Design a protein around this ligand. Structure first.
Ligand SMILES: [Zn+2]
Ligand SMILES: [Zn+2]
Length: 82
């Protein structure tokens, strides 16, 4: 309900560095690796591409497909690199 507008997240060197060993980008969805996340899962804390999420929820819909657990907090946020 709340969090009308899109939130803003800040990336940390740790993350980039972590994903650096992989050769990818955080903001970049690790689902289709085509578009950014532009979303966030809470209270868990898993990011992903909504447009992709729907695909998951279109096949199941069992909360966050990352922790296969229901979601409480969700909204269109804007991922920003460091
Ligand atoms: Zn995507
Ligand atoms: Zn999750």
């Amino acid at each position: 309900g709340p969090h009308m507008g899109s939130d803003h997240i800040k990336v940390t060197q740790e993350q980039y560095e972590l994903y650096c060993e992989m050769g990818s980008t955080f903001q970049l969805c690790k689902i289709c690796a085509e578009n950014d996340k532009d979303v966030k899962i809470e209270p868990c804390g898993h990011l992903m591409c909504t447009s992709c999420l729907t695909a998951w929820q279109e096949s199941d819909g069992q909360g966050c497909p990352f922790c296969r657990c229901e979601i409480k907090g969700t909204e269109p946020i804007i991922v920003d690199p460091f």
